[PDB]
JSON list of C-alpha atoms in Angstrom, two decimals:
[
{"chain": "R", "resi": 1, "resn": "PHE", "atom": "CA", "xyz": [70.37, 82.11, 33.49]},
{"chain": "R", "resi": 2, "resn": "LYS", "atom": "CA", "xyz": [67.57, 79.92, 35.00]},
{"chain": "R", "resi": 3, "resn": "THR", "atom": "CA", "xyz": [66.96, 76.24, 34.11]},
{"chain": "R", "resi": 4, "resn": "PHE", "atom": "CA", "xyz": [63.57, 75.36, 35.60]},
{"chain": "R", "resi": 5, "resn": "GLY", "atom": "CA", "xyz": [60.37, 77.14, 34.64]},
{"chain": "R", "resi": 6, "resn": "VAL", "atom": "CA", "xyz": [61.62, 78.32, 31.24]},
{"chain": "R", "resi": 7, "resn": "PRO", "atom": "CA", "xyz": [60.57, 77.34, 27.69]},
{"chain": "R", "resi": 8, "resn": "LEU", "atom": "CA", "xyz": [62.34, 74.24, 26.40]},
{"chain": "R", "resi": 9, "resn": "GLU", "atom": "CA", "xyz": [63.26, 76.19, 23.21]},
{"chain": "R", "resi": 10, "resn": "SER", "atom": "CA", "xyz": [65.22, 78.73, 25.22]},
{"chain": "R", "resi": 11, "resn": "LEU", "atom": "CA", "xyz": [67.37, 76.04, 26.85]},
{"chain": "R", "resi": 12, "resn": "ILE", "atom": "CA", "xyz": [68.75, 74.31, 23.73]},
{"chain": "R", "resi": 13, "resn": "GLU", "atom": "CA", "xyz": [70.66, 77.22, 22.10]},
{"chain": "R", "resi": 14, "resn": "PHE", "atom": "CA", "xyz": [73.77, 75.96, 24.01]},
{"chain": "R", "resi": 15, "resn": "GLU", "atom": "CA", "xyz": [73.25, 72.30, 22.98]},
{"chain": "R", "resi": 16, "resn": "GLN", "atom": "CA", "xyz": [74.31, 71.05, 19.52]},
{"chain": "R", "resi": 17, "resn": "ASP", "atom": "CA", "xyz": [72.22, 67.85, 20.22]},
{"chain": "R", "resi": 18, "resn": "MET", "atom": "CA", "xyz": [69.06, 69.84, 21.19]},
{"chain": "R", "resi": 19, "resn": "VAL", "atom": "CA", "xyz": [68.47, 68.14, 24.59]},
{"chain": "R", "resi": 20, "resn": "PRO", "atom": "CA", "xyz": [68.97, 70.34, 27.71]},
{"chain": "R", "resi": 21, "resn": "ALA", "atom": "CA", "xyz": [72.03, 69.47, 29.75]},
{"chain": "R", "resi": 22, "resn": "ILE", "atom": "CA", "xyz": [69.95, 68.82, 32.89]},
{"chain": "R", "resi": 23, "resn": "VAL", "atom": "CA", "xyz": [67.77, 66.22, 31.13]},
{"chain": "R", "resi": 24, "resn": "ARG", "atom": "CA", "xyz": [70.88, 64.40, 29.71]},
{"chain": "R", "resi": 25, "resn": "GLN", "atom": "CA", "xyz": [72.52, 64.41, 33.14]},
{"chain": "R", "resi": 26, "resn": "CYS", "atom": "CA", "xyz": [69.55, 63.07, 35.07]},
{"chain": "R", "resi": 27, "resn": "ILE", "atom": "CA", "xyz": [68.98, 60.32, 32.49]},
{"chain": "R", "resi": 28, "resn": "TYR", "atom": "CA", "xyz": [72.67, 59.35, 32.62]},
{"chain": "R", "resi": 29, "resn": "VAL", "atom": "CA", "xyz": [72.44, 58.99, 36.42]},
{"chain": "R", "resi": 30, "resn": "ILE", "atom": "CA", "xyz": [69.29, 56.86, 36.38]},
{"chain": "R", "resi": 31, "resn": "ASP", "atom": "CA", "xyz": [70.61, 54.81, 33.42]},
{"chain": "R", "resi": 32, "resn": "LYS", "atom": "CA", "xyz": [73.86, 53.98, 35.24]},
{"chain": "R", "resi": 33, "resn": "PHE", "atom": "CA", "xyz": [72.70, 53.76, 38.83]},
{"chain": "R", "resi": 34, "resn": "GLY", "atom": "CA", "xyz": [68.90, 53.44, 38.92]},
{"chain": "R", "resi": 35, "resn": "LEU", "atom": "CA", "xyz": [67.27, 51.17, 36.32]},
{"chain": "R", "resi": 36, "resn": "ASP", "atom": "CA", "xyz": [67.18, 48.22, 38.77]},
{"chain": "R", "resi": 37, "resn": "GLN", "atom": "CA", "xyz": [66.25, 50.32, 41.82]},
{"chain": "R", "resi": 38, "resn": "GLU", "atom": "CA", "xyz": [62.94, 49.25, 43.35]},
{"chain": "R", "resi": 39, "resn": "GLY", "atom": "CA", "xyz": [60.34, 51.96, 42.95]},
{"chain": "R", "resi": 40, "resn": "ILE", "atom": "CA", "xyz": [62.41, 54.37, 40.80]},
{"chain": "R", "resi": 41, "resn": "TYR", "atom": "CA", "xyz": [60.06, 57.27, 39.89]},
{"chain": "R", "resi": 42, "resn": "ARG", "atom": "CA", "xyz": [57.21, 55.79, 42.03]},
{"chain": "R", "resi": 43, "resn": "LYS", "atom": "CA", "xyz": [59.21, 56.96, 45.10]},
{"chain": "R", "resi": 44, "resn": "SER", "atom": "CA", "xyz": [58.86, 60.69, 45.64]},
{"chain": "R", "resi": 45, "resn": "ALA", "atom": "CA", "xyz": [62.08, 62.15, 47.04]},
{"chain": "R", "resi": 46, "resn": "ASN", "atom": "CA", "xyz": [61.87, 64.61, 49.98]},
{"chain": "R", "resi": 47, "resn": "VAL", "atom": "CA", "xyz": [60.40, 67.91, 48.59]},
{"chain": "R", "resi": 48, "resn": "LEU", "atom": "CA", "xyz": [63.06, 69.85, 50.49]},
{"chain": "R", "resi": 49, "resn": "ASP", "atom": "CA", "xyz": [65.88, 67.82, 48.85]},
{"chain": "R", "resi": 50, "resn": "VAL", "atom": "CA", "xyz": [64.30, 68.32, 45.40]},
{"chain": "R", "resi": 51, "resn": "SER", "atom": "CA", "xyz": [64.00, 72.09, 46.10]},
{"chain": "R", "resi": 52, "resn": "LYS", "atom": "CA", "xyz": [67.58, 72.52, 47.38]},
{"chain": "R", "resi": 53, "resn": "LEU", "atom": "CA", "xyz": [68.96, 70.82, 44.24]},
{"chain": "R", "resi": 54, "resn": "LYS", "atom": "CA", "xyz": [66.57, 72.69, 41.95]},
{"chain": "R", "resi": 55, "resn": "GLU", "atom": "CA", "xyz": [67.51, 76.07, 43.47]},
{"chain": "R", "resi": 56, "resn": "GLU", "atom": "CA", "xyz": [71.27, 75.32, 43.32]},
{"chain": "R", "resi": 57, "resn": "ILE", "atom": "CA", "xyz": [70.96, 74.57, 39.58]},
{"chain": "R", "resi": 58, "resn": "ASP", "atom": "CA", "xyz": [68.88, 77.71, 38.95]},
{"chain": "R", "resi": 59, "resn": "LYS", "atom": "CA", "xyz": [71.60, 79.78, 40.67]},
{"chain": "R", "resi": 60, "resn": "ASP", "atom": "CA", "xyz": [74.32, 78.26, 38.41]},
{"chain": "R", "resi": 61, "resn": "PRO", "atom": "CA", "xyz": [73.74, 75.83, 35.51]},
{"chain": "R", "resi": 62, "resn": "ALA", "atom": "CA", "xyz": [77.24, 74.37, 36.19]},
{"chain": "R", "resi": 63, "resn": "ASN", "atom": "CA", "xyz": [75.70, 72.86, 39.37]},
{"chain": "R", "resi": 64, "resn": "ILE", "atom": "CA", "xyz": [74.19, 70.00, 37.27]},
{"chain": "R", "resi": 65, "resn": "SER", "atom": "CA", "xyz": [77.55, 68.44, 38.37]},
{"chain": "R", "resi": 66, "resn": "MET", "atom": "CA", "xyz": [75.73, 67.99, 41.73]},
{"chain": "R", "resi": 67, "resn": "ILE", "atom": "CA", "xyz": [73.31, 65.52, 40.05]},
{"chain": "R", "resi": 68, "resn": "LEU", "atom": "CA", "xyz": [76.17, 62.92, 39.77]},
{"chain": "R", "resi": 69, "resn": "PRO", "atom": "CA", "xyz": [75.98, 60.64, 42.84]},
{"chain": "R", "resi": 70, "resn": "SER", "atom": "CA", "xyz": [78.87, 61.37, 45.24]},
{"chain": "R", "resi": 71, "resn": "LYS", "atom": "CA", "xyz": [80.69, 58.26, 46.50]},
{"chain": "R", "resi": 72, "resn": "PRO", "atom": "CA", "xyz": [79.65, 56.14, 48.29]},
{"chain": "R", "resi": 73, "resn": "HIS", "atom": "CA", "xyz": [76.16, 56.55, 46.65]},
{"chain": "R", "resi": 74, "resn": "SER", "atom": "CA", "xyz": [72.86, 55.92, 48.48]},
{"chain": "R", "resi": 75, "resn": "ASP", "atom": "CA", "xyz": [69.44, 54.78, 47.25]},
{"chain": "R", "resi": 76, "resn": "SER", "atom": "CA", "xyz": [67.94, 58.13, 48.21]},
{"chain": "R", "resi": 77, "resn": "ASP", "atom": "CA", "xyz": [70.40, 60.11, 46.01]},
{"chain": "R", "resi": 78, "resn": "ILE", "atom": "CA", "xyz": [69.15, 58.08, 43.07]},
{"chain": "R", "resi": 79, "resn": "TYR", "atom": "CA", "xyz": [65.48, 58.55, 44.00]},
{"chain": "R", "resi": 80, "resn": "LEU", "atom": "CA", "xyz": [66.25, 62.29, 44.30]},
{"chain": "R", "resi": 81, "resn": "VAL", "atom": "CA", "xyz": [67.54, 62.48, 40.72]},
{"chain": "R", "resi": 82, "resn": "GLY", "atom": "CA", "xyz": [64.43, 60.76, 39.42]},
{"chain": "R", "resi": 83, "resn": "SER", "atom": "CA", "xyz": [62.22, 63.23, 41.30]},
{"chain": "R", "resi": 84, "resn": "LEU", "atom": "CA", "xyz": [64.34, 66.10, 40.03]},
{"chain": "R", "resi": 85, "resn": "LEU", "atom": "CA", "xyz": [63.88, 64.99, 36.41]},
{"chain": "R", "resi": 86, "resn": "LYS", "atom": "CA", "xyz": [60.13, 64.70, 36.85]},
{"chain": "R", "resi": 87, "resn": "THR", "atom": "CA", "xyz": [60.06, 68.19, 38.46]},
{"chain": "R", "resi": 88, "resn": "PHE", "atom": "CA", "xyz": [61.92, 69.58, 35.46]},
{"chain": "R", "resi": 89, "resn": "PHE", "atom": "CA", "xyz": [59.25, 68.35, 33.05]},
{"chain": "R", "resi": 90, "resn": "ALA", "atom": "CA", "xyz": [56.42, 69.41, 35.43]},
{"chain": "R", "resi": 91, "resn": "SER", "atom": "CA", "xyz": [57.91, 72.93, 35.74]},
{"chain": "R", "resi": 92, "resn": "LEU", "atom": "CA", "xyz": [58.12, 73.55, 31.96]},
{"chain": "R", "resi": 93, "resn": "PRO", "atom": "CA", "xyz": [55.71, 76.35, 30.98]},
{"chain": "R", "resi": 94, "resn": "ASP", "atom": "CA", "xyz": [54.16, 74.04, 28.33]},
{"chain": "R", "resi": 95, "resn": "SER", "atom": "CA", "xyz": [53.95, 70.26, 28.28]},
{"chain": "R", "resi": 96, "resn": "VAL", "atom": "CA", "xyz": [56.72, 68.57, 26.18]},
{"chain": "R", "resi": 97, "resn": "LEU", "atom": "CA", "xyz": [53.78, 67.31, 24.13]},
{"chain": "R", "resi": 98, "resn": "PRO", "atom": "CA", "xyz": [52.36, 70.82, 23.66]},
{"chain": "R", "resi": 99, "resn": "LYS", "atom": "CA", "xyz": [48.83, 71.83, 24.81]},
{"chain": "R", "resi": 100, "resn": "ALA", "atom": "CA", "xyz": [48.17, 72.85, 21.18]},
{"chain": "R", "resi": 101, "resn": "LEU", "atom": "CA", "xyz": [48.22, 69.13, 20.25]},
{"chain": "R", "resi": 102, "resn": "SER", "atom": "CA", "xyz": [45.26, 68.35, 22.61]},
{"chain": "R", "resi": 103, "resn": "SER", "atom": "CA", "xyz": [42.63, 68.05, 19.83]},
{"chain": "R", "resi": 104, "resn": "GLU", "atom": "CA", "xyz": [44.78, 65.85, 17.60]},
{"chain": "R", "resi": 105, "resn": "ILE", "atom": "CA", "xyz": [45.69, 63.71, 20.66]},
{"chain": "R", "resi": 106, "resn": "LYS", "atom": "CA", "xyz": [41.94, 63.29, 21.37]},
{"chain": "R", "resi": 107, "resn": "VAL", "atom": "CA", "xyz": [41.35, 62.15, 17.78]},
{"chain": "R", "resi": 108, "resn": "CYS", "atom": "CA", "xyz": [44.36, 59.77, 18.12]},
{"chain": "R", "resi": 109, "resn": "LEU", "atom": "CA", "xyz": [42.97, 58.16, 21.32]},
{"chain": "R", "resi": 110, "resn": "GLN", "atom": "CA", "xyz": [39.58, 57.27, 19.66]},
{"chain": "R", "resi": 111, "resn": "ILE", "atom": "CA", "xyz": [41.30, 55.22, 16.90]},
{"chain": "R", "resi": 112, "resn": "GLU", "atom": "CA", "xyz": [40.64, 51.49, 17.60]},
{"chain": "R", "resi": 113, "resn": "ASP", "atom": "CA", "xyz": [43.03, 50.03, 14.92]},
{"chain": "R", "resi": 114, "resn": "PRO", "atom": "CA", "xyz": [46.51, 49.87, 16.51]},
{"chain": "R", "resi": 115, "resn": "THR", "atom": "CA", "xyz": [48.54, 50.35, 13.27]},
{"chain": "R", "resi": 116, "resn": "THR", "atom": "CA", "xyz": [46.43, 53.38, 12.27]},
{"chain": "R", "resi": 117, "resn": "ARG", "atom": "CA", "xyz": [46.75, 54.71, 15.86]},
{"chain": "R", "resi": 118, "resn": "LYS", "atom": "CA", "xyz": [50.55, 54.47, 15.96]},
{"chain": "R", "resi": 119, "resn": "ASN", "atom": "CA", "xyz": [51.05, 55.94, 12.47]},
{"chain": "R", "resi": 120, "resn": "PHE", "atom": "CA", "xyz": [48.75, 58.79, 13.58]},
{"chain": "R", "resi": 121, "resn": "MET", "atom": "CA", "xyz": [50.86, 59.45, 16.67]},
{"chain": "R", "resi": 122, "resn": "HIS", "atom": "CA", "xyz": [54.06, 59.16, 14.54]},
{"chain": "R", "resi": 123, "resn": "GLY", "atom": "CA", "xyz": [52.73, 62.08, 12.49]},
{"chain": "R", "resi": 124, "resn": "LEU", "atom": "CA", "xyz": [52.18, 64.21, 15.59]},
{"chain": "R", "resi": 125, "resn": "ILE", "atom": "CA", "xyz": [55.68, 63.36, 16.86]},
{"chain": "R", "resi": 126, "resn": "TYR", "atom": "CA", "xyz": [57.37, 63.95, 13.50]},
{"chain": "R", "resi": 127, "resn": "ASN", "atom": "CA", "xyz": [55.83, 67.43, 13.43]},
{"chain": "R", "resi": 128, "resn": "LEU", "atom": "CA", "xyz": [57.16, 68.53, 16.80]},
{"chain": "R", "resi": 129, "resn": "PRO", "atom": "CA", "xyz": [59.69, 71.30, 16.76]},
{"chain": "R", "resi": 130, "resn": "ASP", "atom": "CA", "xyz": [63.32, 70.22, 17.35]},
{"chain": "R", "resi": 131, "resn": "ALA", "atom": "CA", "xyz": [63.53, 71.06, 21.09]},
{"chain": "R", "resi": 132, "resn": "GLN", "atom": "CA", "xyz": [60.41, 69.02, 21.93]},
{"chain": "R", "resi": 133, "resn": "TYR", "atom": "CA", "xyz": [61.25, 66.25, 19.46]},
{"chain": "R", "resi": 134, "resn": "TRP", "atom": "CA", "xyz": [64.78, 65.53, 20.67]},
{"chain": "R", "resi": 135, "resn": "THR", "atom": "CA", "xyz": [63.93, 65.98, 24.34]},
{"chain": "R", "resi": 136, "resn": "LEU", "atom": "CA", "xyz": [60.89, 63.70, 24.10]},
{"chain": "R", "resi": 137, "resn": "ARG", "atom": "CA", "xyz": [63.01, 61.16, 22.24]},
{"chain": "R", "resi": 138, "resn": "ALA", "atom": "CA", "xyz": [65.61, 61.07, 25.03]},
{"chain": "R", "resi": 139, "resn": "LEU", "atom": "CA", "xyz": [62.99, 60.75, 27.73]},
{"chain": "R", "resi": 140, "resn": "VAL", "atom": "CA", "xyz": [60.96, 58.07, 25.95]},
{"chain": "R", "resi": 141, "resn": "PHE", "atom": "CA", "xyz": [64.04, 55.89, 25.29]},
{"chain": "R", "resi": 142, "resn": "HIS", "atom": "CA", "xyz": [64.98, 56.24, 28.93]},
{"chain": "R", "resi": 143, "resn": "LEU", "atom": "CA", "xyz": [61.53, 55.29, 30.15]},
{"chain": "R", "resi": 144, "resn": "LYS", "atom": "CA", "xyz": [61.55, 52.22, 27.88]},
{"chain": "R", "resi": 145, "resn": "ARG", "atom": "CA", "xyz": [64.87, 51.19, 29.44]},
{"chain": "R", "resi": 146, "resn": "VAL", "atom": "CA", "xyz": [63.15, 51.54, 32.85]},
{"chain": "R", "resi": 147, "resn": "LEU", "atom": "CA", "xyz": [60.38, 49.24, 31.59]},
{"chain": "R", "resi": 148, "resn": "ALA", "atom": "CA", "xyz": [62.90, 46.72, 30.28]},
{"chain": "R", "resi": 149, "resn": "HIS", "atom": "CA", "xyz": [64.10, 46.42, 33.89]},
{"chain": "R", "resi": 150, "resn": "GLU", "atom": "CA", "xyz": [60.60, 45.85, 35.49]},
{"chain": "R", "resi": 151, "resn": "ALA", "atom": "CA", "xyz": [61.64, 42.51, 36.97]},
{"chain": "R", "resi": 152, "resn": "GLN", "atom": "CA", "xyz": [63.98, 44.50, 39.31]},
{"chain": "R", "resi": 153, "resn": "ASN", "atom": "CA", "xyz": [62.40, 47.96, 39.61]},
{"chain": "R", "resi": 154, "resn": "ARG", "atom": "CA", "xyz": [58.79, 46.60, 39.82]},
{"chain": "R", "resi": 155, "resn": "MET", "atom": "CA", "xyz": [57.42, 49.38, 37.56]},
{"chain": "R", "resi": 156, "resn": "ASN", "atom": "CA", "xyz": [54.73, 48.28, 35.17]},
{"chain": "R", "resi": 157, "resn": "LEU", "atom": "CA", "xyz": [53.65, 50.30, 32.11]},
{"chain": "R", "resi": 158, "resn": "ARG", "atom": "CA", "xyz": [50.47, 51.69, 33.76]},
{"chain": "R", "resi": 159, "resn": "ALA", "atom": "CA", "xyz": [52.30, 52.84, 36.91]},
{"chain": "R", "resi": 160, "resn": "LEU", "atom": "CA", "xyz": [54.85, 54.55, 34.70]},
{"chain": "R", "resi": 161, "resn": "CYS", "atom": "CA", "xyz": [52.05, 56.35, 32.77]},
{"chain": "R", "resi": 162, "resn": "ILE", "atom": "CA", "xyz": [50.34, 57.50, 36.00]},
{"chain": "R", "resi": 163, "resn": "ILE", "atom": "CA", "xyz": [53.65, 59.00, 37.11]},
{"chain": "R", "resi": 164, "resn": "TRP", "atom": "CA", "xyz": [54.74, 60.55, 33.79]},
{"chain": "R", "resi": 165, "resn": "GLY", "atom": "CA", "xyz": [51.59, 61.15, 31.74]},
{"chain": "R", "resi": 166, "resn": "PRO", "atom": "CA", "xyz": [50.36, 64.26, 33.56]},
{"chain": "R", "resi": 167, "resn": "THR", "atom": "CA", "xyz": [53.88, 65.65, 33.31]},
{"chain": "R", "resi": 168, "resn": "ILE", "atom": "CA", "xyz": [54.37, 64.95, 29.54]},
{"chain": "R", "resi": 169, "resn": "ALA", "atom": "CA", "xyz": [50.97, 65.11, 27.92]},
{"chain": "R", "resi": 170, "resn": "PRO", "atom": "CA", "xyz": [48.45, 67.97, 28.00]},
{"chain": "R", "resi": 171, "resn": "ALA", "atom": "CA", "xyz": [45.20, 67.65, 29.96]},
{"chain": "R", "resi": 172, "resn": "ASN", "atom": "CA", "xyz": [41.83, 66.57, 28.52]},
{"chain": "R", "resi": 173, "resn": "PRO", "atom": "CA", "xyz": [40.61, 69.77, 26.78]},
{"chain": "R", "resi": 174, "resn": "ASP", "atom": "CA", "xyz": [36.96, 68.73, 27.44]},
{"chain": "R", "resi": 175, "resn": "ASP", "atom": "CA", "xyz": [37.63, 67.61, 31.07]},
{"chain": "R", "resi": 176, "resn": "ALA", "atom": "CA", "xyz": [40.26, 69.21, 33.39]},
{"chain": "R", "resi": 177, "resn": "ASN", "atom": "CA", "xyz": [39.96, 66.40, 36.00]},
{"chain": "R", "resi": 178, "resn": "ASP", "atom": "CA", "xyz": [40.18, 63.36, 33.64]},
{"chain": "R", "resi": 179, "resn": "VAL", "atom": "CA", "xyz": [43.52, 61.68, 34.49]},
{"chain": "R", "resi": 180, "resn": "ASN", "atom": "CA", "xyz": [42.94, 58.82, 31.93]},
{"chain": "R", "resi": 181, "resn": "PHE", "atom": "CA", "xyz": [43.55, 61.10, 28.92]},
{"chain": "R", "resi": 182, "resn": "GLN", "atom": "CA", "xyz": [47.16, 61.84, 29.89]},
{"chain": "R", "resi": 183, "resn": "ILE", "atom": "CA", "xyz": [47.77, 58.20, 30.95]},
{"chain": "R", "resi": 184, "resn": "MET", "atom": "CA", "xyz": [46.54, 56.84, 27.58]},
{"chain": "R", "resi": 185, "resn": "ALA", "atom": "CA", "xyz": [48.47, 59.47, 25.66]},
{"chain": "R", "resi": 186, "resn": "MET", "atom": "CA", "xyz": [51.61, 58.23, 27.48]},
{"chain": "R", "resi": 187, "resn": "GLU", "atom": "CA", "xyz": [50.86, 54.54, 26.58]},
{"chain": "R", "resi": 188, "resn": "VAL", "atom": "CA", "xyz": [50.37, 55.33, 22.89]},
{"chain": "R", "resi": 189, "resn": "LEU", "atom": "CA", "xyz": [53.57, 57.37, 22.96]},
{"chain": "R", "resi": 190, "resn": "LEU", "atom": "CA", "xyz": [55.55, 54.42, 24.44]},
{"chain": "R", "resi": 191, "resn": "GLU", "atom": "CA", "xyz": [53.97, 51.93, 21.98]},
{"chain": "R", "resi": 192, "resn": "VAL", "atom": "CA", "xyz": [54.92, 54.10, 18.98]},
{"chain": "R", "resi": 193, "resn": "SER", "atom": "CA", "xyz": [58.41, 55.06, 20.08]},
{"chain": "R", "resi": 194, "resn": "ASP", "atom": "CA", "xyz": [60.07, 52.19, 18.21]},
{"chain": "R", "resi": 195, "resn": "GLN", "atom": "CA", "xyz": [58.85, 53.56, 14.86]},
{"chain": "R", "resi": 196, "resn": "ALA", "atom": "CA", "xyz": [58.59, 57.33, 15.67]},
{"chain": "R", "resi": 197, "resn": "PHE", "atom": "CA", "xyz": [62.20, 58.01, 16.71]},
{"chain": "R", "resi": 198, "resn": "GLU", "atom": "CA", "xyz": [65.55, 57.00, 15.15]},
{"chain": "R", "resi": 199, "resn": "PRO", "atom": "CA", "xyz": [67.46, 54.55, 17.43]},
{"chain": "R", "resi": 200, "resn": "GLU", "atom": "CA", "xyz": [70.37, 55.66, 19.66]},
{"chain": "R", "resi": 201, "resn": "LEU", "atom": "CA", "xyz": [73.86, 54.99, 18.10]},
{"chain": "R", "resi": 202, "resn": "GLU", "atom": "CA", "xyz": [75.54, 51.58, 18.91]},
{"chain": "R", "resi": 203, "resn": "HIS", "atom": "CA", "xyz": [79.05, 51.52, 20.49]},
{"chain": "R", "resi": 204, "resn": "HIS", "atom": "CA", "xyz": [80.68, 48.09, 19.91]},
{"chain": "R", "resi": 205, "resn": "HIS", "atom": "CA", "xyz": [83.74, 47.58, 17.65]},
{"chain": "R", "resi": 206, "resn": "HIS", "atom": "CA", "xyz": [85.87, 44.94, 19.39]}
]
């Protein structure tokens, strides 16, 4: 049972919440230990450390336990988990925003009116199948938390879209080398997330 390089659909049969265990785990680690870490996601962990952890998880899905930072934790273990999460999305056979949405994404990106643009993207998001919908929701909420902590992590919106856009969004169908298409798709996605996805549940009853 492999984790990386397989369709997102095939991973969520185990999960009642429809987000793969590896994605939940990595986000938990960065949420708890990494939101204030300078250069989180901008820092590329050692490719050999990403590979070792990747391969261990592919051998046994129970090895997502290894993603939790062993005590005492180090900066580089946290960087590693960020790079691992990015590699997960990059290794998916299809983009989490599917290639088939390219044309409708192109249409979306020409719309000058912001309200029209976000409602348009909402429609695209609402129509995603479950696996993509719930997984994209978890990742987008996480990335917005990262942005909320910019004063410490020094990640601006555009840097975050350079890092994540080519991983999440499909390429320009009319131009394979245009990096701005995926970057802009990522910005519109972040902008719309407040209205496109239901909020995470609130845990305070004191």
